Design a protein around this ligand. Structure first.
Ligand SMILES: O=P(O)(O)O[C@H]1[C@H](OP(=O)(O)O)[C@@H](OP(=O)(O)O)[C@H](OP(=O)(O)O)[C@@H](OP(=O)(O)O)[C@H]1OP(=O)(O)O
Ligand SMILES: CC(C)(C)c1ccc([C@H](Cn2cccc(C(F)(F)F)c2=O)NC2Cc3ccccc3C2)cc1
Lengths: 102, 102, 102, 102, 102, 102
C-alpha cells in the first residue's frame, strides 16, 4: 500500500481517461516490488481516492462493491459529450436560479 | 469474450470515434487466437457493449441488427459538431424549462 | 465496391475536415488494385455517402452535380469555422425558442 | 496558374492560423516552377481565396490591397482566444435576443 | 535559490495538470546543484509561485500548513471537465444576476 | 530590428501561450545577426506587438515598462481556464443586459 511511484501518488489527469491511469495503476503495480497481498489491497483502496474527480465522483457514486469492470463501464462515461455534457449542462442549470446556491 | 487483450475490454474513448475504434475491435481480434465462431461472436456482443456511451446510446438506438455500416453512419457524427451539437442542447434545454429535475 | 483499403472504409472523421479525408479517398485508391473507372465510380457513390456528417450535410446541401473542386471549397470551413461555428449557434437557438422539439 | 501543390490547393485548415498556412503559401511556392511575375500574382490572388474563413473574412475586413503585414496583424487573432472571443462567442448572444434569425 | 531550468522558470501550462509540470519540477529540482535546504526551501516557496495560475489559486486556497500532498491533490482537481465545470457554471451567472460588474 | 525570421514574423499562436512564443522570441533572436542593442530594442518593441491578442491586451494593461517577469506572470493566465473563463464570461454577460451594443 503506497509503493514507490505506484500508490503514494499514481494520479489520473483531468483529461486523462480512467483507462490510462488505471493502467498506470496496474502496470506500475507490476513495476513496484510489492508482495501479492500488497498489490491487491492497493488496487481497490487507492485507485479510487487518487483518480480524476470526473471518475472519482463515479467510483464513490457507483457505491462500493461495484465490480472493477463496472467502474470501467461507469468511468468510460468520463469524457466530453458524455460526462462533460452533463457537468456543463448541470452546473449551468443550477446557476439558472430555480435552484441556485446562495 | 475474454480472449487475451483483444476482447475483454476493447474500449472506445470519448474522443476516439466509433470509426477508429472499430479497427480496435477487429484489428485487435487479429491478435487473439480465437476460432471464427469465437471472433464473430465477439464482433457483435463485446462491440456494442464496451464501446463509447455516445455511440452505445446510438447502438441501442439504432438497436441490434444494424449492420456495422448503420452503427457507422450514425456514430460518424460522434464528435463535436455532429453529436455535441445535439448533446449540449438536450441536457441544456431539458433541465432549464420543462424537463427540470428536482 | 471498394477493394482492400479503398471504398469499404474510407471514412472521414468528425474532427477531420473534408481536406484531409478527400486526400485519403484518392490516395488509398492508388493503393487499390481496381480498374480506372472503378476509381471514378468510387468517388461519386461512396465519398459523399460514407464521409463525416459535416461534409455530408454540406454535400447534400451543395446539391449533387457540384464538382469536387466545388466540394472542396464548400467543406473548407468544415472544422471549426464554417461548420462548427454555424452549428453551435443554431442548435442552441432552434431547440430553444421556436424550433423547440417536444 | 498554379503548378502541382503550389496554388491549386494551398489551403488553410479550419483550426489552422494564417501563420501556418502563410508559411505553406510561402513554402510550396518555392517548389513551384513559376515566373517571377506569376508568383507575385499568386500570393495576392490565391492566398486570400483559400485562407481559413476566420482569417479569410478578415482579409475582407481589412479588405483587398492591404499590406501583407496588415493581413497578418489582423489574422493573428484567428484561433482560440482572439478570433473566437469575438465571433461565435457573439453569435451565441446574437441569435438569442435581437439577432434572432427565422 | 533558483538554478537554471530548475526554479528560475519552472512553470506549468495553462491546462497542464500540476502533475506533468511537477514531473518537471521534481526532476529538475534534483538536477540543480542546490544545498539540501536550498532545494527543500525551493520546493515550498517556488512550487506555489511559478505554477499555472489555476493550480496556484488552489494552492493558496488550501492554505499553507496543508501537506504537500494536499497541494497537488487539490491541484489534481485543476481542469477541463471538473475545474472548468465549476468555473463555467459560476462565472457566467455571477456577472449576469448579482455579481454584475460595471 | 528586422533580421530574417527573428522579429518580422516571430508570432504567438492563438492557443499557444505567452510562454512558448516568448521562447520563440528569445531563441530566434540568437539566430539573428544583430547588434546587442539591436536585440534589446527587438524584445521590447516587437514582443508586445506581434504576440497573441490575449497576452497583447494584457501587456498593454500591465502597462509598458513592466518587467518581462511581469508580462510572464500576467500572461501565464492566457489559456483556457484562467483567461478564457473571464473572456467568455464577460462578453456573454455584457452583450446580454446592460452593455448590449447596438
Ligand atoms: O480546432 P480543432 O482541431 O477541431 O479542435 C478545437 C481546438 O482544440 P485543440 O487545442 O486540440 O486544437 C480548440 O482550441 P482553441 O485553439 O480554440 O483553444 C478547442 O477550444 P477549447 O479548449 O477552448 O475548448 C475547440 O473547442 P471549441 O470549438 O469548443 O472552442 C476544439 O474543437 P472540438 O471540441 O470541436 O474538437
Ligand atoms: C469561447 C471560445 C472558447 C473562445 C470559443 C467560442 C466559439 C468558437 C467557434 C467559432 N469560431 C471562432 C473563431 C474561430 C473559429 C475557427 F478557427 F475555429 F474557425 C471558429 O469556429 N465555435 C465552436 C465550434 C465548437 C465545437 C465544439 C463545441 C463548441 C463549439 C463552438 C471557438 C471558441
Amino acid at each position: 500500500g503506497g509503493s514507490p511511484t505506484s500508490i503514494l501518488d499514481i494520479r489520473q489527469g483531468p483529461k486523462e481517461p480512467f483507462r490510462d491511469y488505471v493502467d498506470r495503476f496496474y502496470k506500475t503495480l507490476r513495476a513496484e516490488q510489492a508482495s501479492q497481498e500488497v498489490k491487491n489491497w492497493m488496487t481497490e483502496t487507492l485507485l479510487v481516492q487518487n483518480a480524476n474527480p470526473d471518475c472519482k465522483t463515479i467510483l464513490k457514486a457507483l457505491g462500493p462493491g461495484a465490480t472493477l469492470e463496472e467502474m470501467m463501464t461507469a468511468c468510460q462515461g468520463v469524457g466530453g459529450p458524455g460526462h462533460k455534457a452533463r457537468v456543463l449542462a448541470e452546473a449551468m442549470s443550477q446557476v439558472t436560479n430555480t435552484a441556485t446556491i446562495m
